[PDB]
């Protein structure tokens with residue numbers, strides 16, 4: 001099938017990026033030796049997911065011109081990319097995906113996949129602002145689980161943010177606004193950061209523009225920031 005993450009990478013960015021995805025855990029994918037301590041005591045389902053996602057990452061790197069390398073885990077769980085590379089990883093039920101780019105062209109990337117299923121009201125209240133719960137249902141087509149799409153967009157926001165700030169970003173630290181395309185299955189979002197927006201260097205992260213998509217029972221979101 002066609003790759004789902006394509007739908008949330010706009011033309012302005014897609015040619016600076018490489019990506020790969022899978023919808024299962026193929027047998028005989030293996031970790032690189034350096035990675036094995038990370039999943040040595042993990043349950044098989046996590047072990048295999050980890051392996052598959054790292055495999056997608058190396059396939060994408062390969063497309064970028066980067067030889068296969070181990071991808072370790074940093075201090076706050078972030079992937080350790082090779083120098084000169086930025087990227088993002090995501091998994092959920094029925095999806096494993098990776099997007100990478102060269103850091104000379106791409107400042108940061110965050111992606112996230114979720115099942116297109118409802119969230120509990122308890123979760124919705126923890127991850128949303130009162131104003132989002134008022135605004136989004138009007139912006140989004142009936143039938144979309146906009147609670148999950150919101151949640152997915154917030155997680156993508158953190159992933160694009162952390163490599164540029166090395167600071168925490170909570171769910172109530174960004175206000176997300178949505179629009180829907182005519183298809184009703186794709187659209188844009190903007191995350192407005194509500195805390196100190198300063199990057200470690202360069203321009204501040206004040207308003208982050210992303211894309212969302214619903215297809216094959218999945219929500220995909222992505223934010224891509226280019227180097228200017």
Ligand SMILES: CC(C)(COP(=O)(O)OP(=O)(O)OC[C@H]1O[C@@H](n2cnc3c(N)ncnc32)[C@H](O)[C@@H]1OP(=O)(O)O)[C@@H](O)C(=O)NCCC(=O)NCCS
Pocket residue numbers: 050053073076077078079088089090091092111112113154155156157158159160162163169170171172173174
């Ligand atoms: C870490 C988190 C963002 C992961 O998102 P998720 O949708 O639950 O799970 P995903 O499978 O999509 O993503 C997991 C991957 O995120 C990546 N990740 C973890 N921490 C990260 C960080 N600090 N920066 C960037 N990427 C990170 C990892 O690569 C991980 O996979 P791996 O363990 O195989 O290497 C999420 O679990 C979380 O804890 N969020 C709290 C922060 C947040 O979302 N704030 C909202 C800001 S508006």
Ligand SMILES: [Mg+2]
Pocket residue numbers: 090091092112113114152155
């Ligand atoms: Mg997710």
